[PDB]
Amino acid sequence: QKRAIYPGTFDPITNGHIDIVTRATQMFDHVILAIAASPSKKPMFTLEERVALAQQATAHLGNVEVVGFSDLMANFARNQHATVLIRGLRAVADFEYEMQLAHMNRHLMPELESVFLMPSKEWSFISSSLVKEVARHQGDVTHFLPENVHQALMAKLAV
Amino acid sequence: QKRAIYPGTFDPITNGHIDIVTRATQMFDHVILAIAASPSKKPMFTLEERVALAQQATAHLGNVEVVGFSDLMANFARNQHATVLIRGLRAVADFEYEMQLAHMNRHLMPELESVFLMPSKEWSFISSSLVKEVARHQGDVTHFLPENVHQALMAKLAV
Amino acid sequence: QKRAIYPGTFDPITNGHIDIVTRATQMFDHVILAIAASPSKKPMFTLEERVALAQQATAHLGNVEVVGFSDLMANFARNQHATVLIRGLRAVADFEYEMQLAHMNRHLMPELESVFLMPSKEWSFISSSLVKEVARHQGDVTHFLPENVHQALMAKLAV
Amino acid sequence: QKRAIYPGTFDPITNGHIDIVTRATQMFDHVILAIAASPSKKPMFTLEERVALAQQATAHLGNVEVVGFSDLMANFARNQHATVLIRGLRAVADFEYEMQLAHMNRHLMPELESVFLMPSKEWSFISSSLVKEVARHQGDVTHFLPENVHQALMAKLAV
Amino acid sequence: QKRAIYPGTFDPITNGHIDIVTRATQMFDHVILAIAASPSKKPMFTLEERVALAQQATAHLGNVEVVGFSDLMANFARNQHATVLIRGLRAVADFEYEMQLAHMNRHLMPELESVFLMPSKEWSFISSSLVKEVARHQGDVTHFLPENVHQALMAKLAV
Amino acid sequence: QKRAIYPGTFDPITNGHIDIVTRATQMFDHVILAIAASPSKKPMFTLEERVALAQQATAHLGNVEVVGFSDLMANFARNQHATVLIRGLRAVADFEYEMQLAHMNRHLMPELESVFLMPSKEWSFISSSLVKEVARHQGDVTHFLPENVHQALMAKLAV
Ligand SMILES: Cc1nc2cccc(O)c2[nH]1
Ligand SMILES: Cc1nc2cccc(O)c2[nH]1
Ligand SMILES: Cc1nc2cccc(O)c2[nH]1
Ligand SMILES: Cc1nc2cccc(O)c2[nH]1
Ligand SMILES: Cc1nc2cccc(O)c2[nH]1
Ligand SMILES: Cc1nc2cccc(O)c2[nH]1
Ligand SMILES: [Cl-]
Ligand SMILES: [Cl-]
Ligand SMILES: [Cl-]
């Protein structure tokens, strides 16, 4: 009945993302983990890779649905019959950008309510960007990623 | 099914608060607007005034319950069987303090989720303290308050 | 007599920019809207496009002069006999970068005073970057741009 | 023609304030240095002390007028026929509070423009409160104050 | 050879403080844990209580010296022949205020270097004030304090 | 005996960097100025150029060692037997990113203590990026760079 969308680039999905979507499923009946194509960010993993990684990483959560999209997130939320948009908040830079996004999304879809969750202390200082940078220099990021994602990141960089 | 609390001092309740609680009622089945006694900040309105003002200002919202409390926010939420704690986010200063409170509340009550809502642009720059400061110095705050609150504030300041 | 420069990339000029330059004209006798070439930012519109867009968008303001430039803004301000440099302030990230810029410009031209204006609430959460991103995904940005700019942005993306 | 007000508590006026008001006088025809009674913060110097100190410290500026006021900043600016309100910006904490005040002042007096000036690097880390705190604890604040203010502060602290 | 001071009110000392001072002892030969009398903030524990609590809580650290002081931090560091001043950084609000203090301390004592340490994620969201606030309102703060401090806090709050 | 690493891209090294490393040498017995290859940032100067520039710029400091590296900084610090990692803190954006880095480095090398220094007021608003931008537009940056670096930057841009 209550449907929420959790959009992001998820390049790749981290334990921080896993924490947020898990909390979302404890709050709403159905959660769409929505992976934006984000070509402007030149992602390391293709959209199809990121969807598969997230599907495996969230298979244990019964009310999570992983979908990729290139639409405007506001339209995609409407077309998923979502009335809640989930984002995790990490730092001041996040907050300020999320504010901009939320006000734009409110303009585009006024009945879509943006709600923010604060991550666990364990994940409050990591990001996909940071994890990739450490991995690019062969540092150990097993603690920060789902097993399947760590394998795929290692495999990716080994090529 | 989902019970949420929206705690604060509400000294007095503003249109920013009304915006946040209205958004909350569109998200959750039952919202407790929880008014802290907050003696340490020496509020302008008494607790009984603040509760009465907030009840009148939210009477049109069918699933809002206005309740006073003097306990720790987490203790009151636990006793009310609430699993969601609503907070509005205004500025960076908000965010950092709310981050603190959220991590403390997660420690005190792990089954309580803190969710942050974003106010309309219309109310993004006001607070109870700013409204009181302007009104005390003979500025016009009509636009920022429910009618009943505006009347009570004028009466208060006329001493 | 009092001459001010309002420099920026204006890729493209938004209603937020229009608000700032309009306020500038209410404060100073002559305002130079100065469009930096900004090749490092790889702008969507060429400098000649951006100048024409801004000229049309500000034609109703009698004391606005639109000029493009690739010089150091401090030298360009001196060569325009400007003693005030206008910038609009939006978020914390803006403020911190504008501070850096102002201190550098003060080093380069000590008699050029940098003054900052805060935008209307309506435009406090938009930017050229955000508007382009929404438009790239076919979202409606008519509310955020001058008519001529919206047409040109639509036309640009339709190719 | 252009009348600007520079309001504050100036308890006491520092070289940071002198820097800001000096820059203002180079921008606008007439600058009112407006000293708030500010009883709620319990100032160290009385209003008559603060006005006298500021007058002496700005006597070399021909187009500065030092005036005390107890009204709302917007009410005083309106009554003084000022169309510019000067504020100095120091840090992020400044910025966010000044943003609030600016939006409130625009609501209260739309014909009043808030303009923000940036202090010299020399004064970017001081405030009246910090200076008083250092001086009270037997630290050297000579570098941060006009001579007349430094003398009065020593006299005050000798009690 | 290197003497460092770690000043604060420590009202009361928390596991965050213990973390910072422990890291300091691993960096410098001798660390003075300097407890400010700080009457202006009206501390919950007296100075003699705060010193006694901190001594017990740091007895396992061989190169820590706990000392009370009522002078300016810079004056005390000079008199203790310390050339390093330790401060912990928690949030953005910390950072900006510490930046101020550091620039003032460099002016007052140029031969004193301010170094900023970062607390563990475990303690990154707590402070003495937050701990007192939670404990006063019947919240569990056992995890955040040394055992001896927890006992003294309970005793204090039982009044 | 006490060994510290000061890592960064140093593209090119500025007087701000010189201030930080100089302060580091006043605090620790041996300082490794470590220049990260940073190919993702597409540096203006090659690693070998940046090392030579930094060597010349720090030749007057007896206990500075300039080394380039492409390793993970945490591993490089271990392999240099460094137990302190120095970073200068400039703005809020710096602080938030440095926090992320420090927590990651603590995960990778728990006995490596990250310590932050606040730069002199003179250099608190400059960066390699800003200096390059001014130089690209033929503005005078002699005040911000060591002589040898200014020459090399001029030479670079003259080609
Ligand atoms: C892909 C995408 N970028 C956006 C930016 C703002 C609002 C939206 O709905 C957006 N969707
Ligand atoms: C009254 C009150 N102060 C708090 C501080 C932290 C957490 C809480 O739940 C609190 N409740
Ligand atoms: C194009 C341009 N970038 C600048 C950076 C700093 C100062 C200036 O005057 C600048 N002009
Ligand atoms: C004394 C005073 N407090 C204010 C708050 C907001 C706006 C104003 O103009 C104010 N004046
Ligand atoms: C007690 C005290 N307040 C201070 C403020 C600035 C610098 C210092 O060294 C201080 N010490
Ligand atoms: C080159 C490099 N990037 C890093 C990011 C995090 C930690 C490290 O140790 C790093 N080293
Ligand atoms: Cl209380
Ligand atoms: Cl007052
Ligand atoms: Cl004190």
One-character DSSP codes across C26-44: TTSSEEEEEEE--GGG--S
Mutate to test the interface with B, among E126, E134, E136, E157 (most CBs of B within 10 A): E134
Dig out the tokens for B19 from the structure.
């915006």
Dig out the tokens for D94 from the structure.
């400044």
Residue A13: count other Cβ atoms within 10 Å of its Cβ. Answer: 28
Stretch 20-49 of chain F: residues touching chain E, C-beta under 8 Å:
23, 26-27
Ligand 1 atom with minimal separation from the A37 CA: 1
Report how far ligand 8's centroid is from the alpha carbon of D41 (Å). Answer: 7
Q: Which residue has the tokens 């009370």?
A: E68
Classify strands B64-69 and A113-117 as parallel, antiparallel or unpaired.
Answer: unpaired
The backbone torsions φ and ψ at residue B75, rounded to the nearest 5 degrees and listed phi first, read -65, -45
DSSP B134-156: HHHTT---GGGS-HHHHHHHHHH
Pocket test for ligand 4, best of D73, D85, D109 (most atoms within 8 A of CB): D73
Contact partners, residue C39, CB within 8 Å, separation at least 6: none
Classify strands F30-36 and F64-69 as parallel, antiparallel or unpaired.
Answer: parallel
CATH of the domain at E7: 3.40.50.620
Residue C122 is given by DSSP the state: G
Answer whether E100's CB lies under 8 Å from D130's CB. Answer: yes
Contact A27 B121 (CB under 8 A): no
Of A140, D86, A100, which is closest to residue C94 (Cα–Cα)?
Answer: A100
Q: How many residues does chain F have?
A: 159
Q: Give the separation between CA B38 and CA B16, rounded to whole angstroms.
A: 19
Integer CA distances (angstroms), F137 to C72, C98, C100, D49, F132, in order: 5, 18, 16, 50, 9
Residues of A in contact with E120 (CB under 8 A): none
The backbone torsions φ and ψ at residue E31, rounded to the nearest 5 degrees and listed phi first, read -120, 120
- Catalytically active residues of B are 17, 41, 90, 128
Of F85, E25, D157, D96, which is closest to residue C118 (Cα–Cα)?
Answer: D96
Q: Give the separation between CA D2 and CA D81, rounded to whole angstroms.
A: 9
- Catalytically active residues of F are 17, 41, 90, 128
Spell out the SS3 assignment of D111-138.
Answer: CCEEEEECCCHHHCCCCHHHHHHHHHCC
Check if C73 has its Cβ closer than 6 Å to any atom of ligand 3.
yes
Of A125, A118, A116, A117, which is closest to residue A143 (Cα–Cα)?
Answer: A125
In which domain, by residue range, is A51 found? 1-159
Q: Give the separation between CA B59 and CA B18, rounded to whole angstroms.
A: 11
Residues of F in contact with D125 (CB under 8 A): 121
Contact partners, residue D153, CB within 8 Å, separation at least 6: D12, D131, D132, D135, D141, D145
Residue A128 is given by DSSP the state: H
Return the residue of E nearest to A92 by Cα: E92
Q: Helix-strand-coil percent breakdown of chain A, rounded to 5?
A: 50, 20, 35
Contact partners, residue B141, CB within 8 Å, separation at least 6: B131, B134, B135, B150, B153
Q: Give the separation between CA B51 and CA B5, rounded to whole angstroms.
A: 15
- Catalytically active residues of A are 17, 41, 90, 128
Return the residue of A nearest to F36 by Cα: A137
Q: Which residue has the tokens 């890779």?
A: A49
Report how far ligand 9's centroid is from the alpha carbon of D150 (Å). Answer: 20
Dig out the tokens for E83 from the structure.
């050339």
Residue E63 is given by DSSP the state: T
**Solved how?**
X-ray
The backbone torsions φ and ψ at residue E62, rounded to the nearest 5 degrees and listed phi first, read -65, -30
Report how far ligand 8's centroid is from the alpha carbon of D147 (Å). Answer: 28
Contact C92 F92 (CB under 8 A): yes
Of B91, B95, B76, which is closest to residue B33 (Cα–Cα)?
Answer: B76
In DSSP terms, A66 is beta-bridged to A33
Dig out the tokens for A45 from the structure.
């993993």
Q: Give the separation between CA E34 and CA E64, rounded to whole angstroms.
A: 10
Total domains in the fold of chain F: 1
Of F153, F112, F7, which is closest to residue F70 (Cα–Cα)?
Answer: F7
Strands (E), chain F: 3-8, 30-36, 64-69, 84-88, 113-117
Spell out the SS3 assignment of B70-124.
Answer: CCCHHHHHHHCCCCEEEEECCCHHHHHHHHHHHHHHHHHCCCCEEEEECCCHHHC
Q: What type of residue is C148?
A: N
Tell me the ligand closest to D43's alpha carbon: 8
Classify strands A113-117 and B113-117 as parallel, antiparallel or unpaired.
Answer: antiparallel
3-state secondary structure of E84: strand
The backbone torsions φ and ψ at residue F31, rounded to the nearest 5 degrees and listed phi first, read -120, 125
Classify strands F30-36 and E84-88 as parallel, antiparallel or unpaired.
Answer: unpaired
Tell me the ligand closest to A9's alpha carbon: 1
Return the residue of C nearest to D22 by Cα: C113
Q: How many residues does chain A have?
A: 159
3-state secondary structure of C22: helix
Dig out the tokens for A99 from the structure.
């504010």
Q: Which helix (H) or strand (E) holds D64?
A: strand D64-69
Q: Give the separation between CA C104 and CA C87, rounded to whole angstroms.
A: 14
Q: Does E90 participate in catalysis according to the annotation?
A: yes
Contact partners, residue D21, CB within 8 Å, separation at least 6: D6, D31, D33, D58, D61, D64, D86
Q: Give the separation between CA C25 and CA C34, rounded to whole angstroms.
A: 14
Q: Give the separation between CA E60 and CA F47, rounded to whole angstroms.
A: 46
Sheet holding B3-8, edge to edge: A64-69, A30-36, A3-8, A84-88, A113-117, B113-117, B84-88, B3-8, B30-36, B64-69
In DSSP terms, D115 is beta-bridged to C117, D86
3-state secondary structure of C97: helix
Rounded to a whole number of angstroms, the distance from the CA of F26 to the nearest CA of chain C is 28
Rounded to a whole number of angstroms, the distance from the CA of B143 to the nearest CA of chain E is 31
Of D95, D102, D106, the CB nearest to C95: D95
Of B120, B38, B20, B139, which is closest to residue B131 (Cα–Cα)?
Answer: B139
Q: Give the separation between CA B34 and CA B79, rounded to whole angstroms.
A: 12
Stretch 60-119 of chain C: residues touching chain F, C-beta under 8 Å:
70-72, 74-75, 92-93, 96, 99-101, 103-104, 107-108
How does A21-52 read in b/e, with b if 16+ C-beta sit within 10 Å?
bbbbbebbebbbbbbbbeeeeebbbebebbbb
The backbone torsions φ and ψ at residue B24, rounded to the nearest 5 degrees and listed phi first, read -65, -45
Q: Give the separation between CA E51 and CA E66, rounded to whole angstroms.
A: 7
Mutate to test the interface with E, among D134, D141, D143, D144 (most CBs of E within 10 A): D134
Q: Does E17 participate in catalysis according to the annotation?
A: yes
Q: Treating both helix axes as pointing N-terminal to C-terminal, what angle do A147-158 and A47-58 enclose, rounded to 10 degrees?
A: 150
Contact E72 D126 (CB under 8 A): no
Classify strands C3-8 and B113-117 as parallel, antiparallel or unpaired.
Answer: unpaired
Of E140, D120, F76, which is closest to residue C105 (Cα–Cα)?
Answer: D120
Q: Give the separation between CA F86 and CA F4, rounded to whole angstroms.
A: 7
Classify strands D3-8 and C113-117 as parallel, antiparallel or unpaired.
Answer: unpaired
The backbone torsions φ and ψ at residue E129, rounded to the nearest 5 degrees and listed phi first, read -65, -45
Report how far ligand 5's centroid is from the alpha carbon of E74 (Å). Answer: 7
Check if B37 has its Cβ closer than 6 Å to any atom of ligand 2.
no
CB pairs B-D closer than 8 Å = 33
Classify strands B113-117 and C64-69 as parallel, antiparallel or unpaired.
Answer: unpaired
Report how far ligand 9's centroid is from the alpha carbon of E39 (Å). Answer: 5
Q: How many residues does chain D have?
A: 159
How does E121-149 read in b/e, with b if 16+ C-beta sit within 10 Å?
bebbbbbbebbbbbbebebebeebbbebb
Q: A120: exposed, middle or buried (C-beta count within 10 Å: 0-12, 13-18, 19+)?
A: middle
B122 at interface of C, judged by CB pairs closer than 8 A: yes
Check if C121 has its Cβ closer than 6 Å to any atom of ligand 1.
no
Contact partners, residue E155, CB within 8 Å, separation at least 6: none
Q: What type of residue is E71?
A: D
Q: Does C2 participate in catalysis according to the annotation?
A: no
CA A43 to chain centre: 13
Report how far ligand 9's centroid is from the alpha carbon of D50 (Å). Answer: 23
Q: Give the separation between CA A31 and CA A23, rounded to whole angstroms.
A: 10
Q: Which residue has the tokens 């608060």?
A: B17
Tell me the ligand closest to E108's alpha carbon: 5
- The number of helices, as runs of H, and strands, as runs of E, in chain A is 6, 5
Answer whether E45's CB lies under 8 Å from E35's CB. Answer: no
Pocket around ligand 5 at a 6 A CB cut-off: D 133-134, 137; E 72-74, 101, 104-105, 108
Residues of B in contact with D100 (CB under 8 A): 91, 125-127, 130
CB pairs A-F closer than 8 Å = 33
Residue A116: count other Cβ atoms within 10 Å of its Cβ. Answer: 24
The answer to whether E78 is annotated as binding is no
Q: Give the separation between CA E131 and CA E145, rounded to whole angstroms.
A: 9
Integer CA distances (angstroms), B25 to B5, B20, B64, B65, D116, in order: 11, 9, 7, 11, 40
CA atoms within 13 A of residue E25's CA, in its CB half-sphere: 17
Answer whether F75's CB lies under 8 Å from A139's CB. Answer: yes
Q: Give the separation between CA C67 and CA C55, rounded to whole angstroms.
A: 9
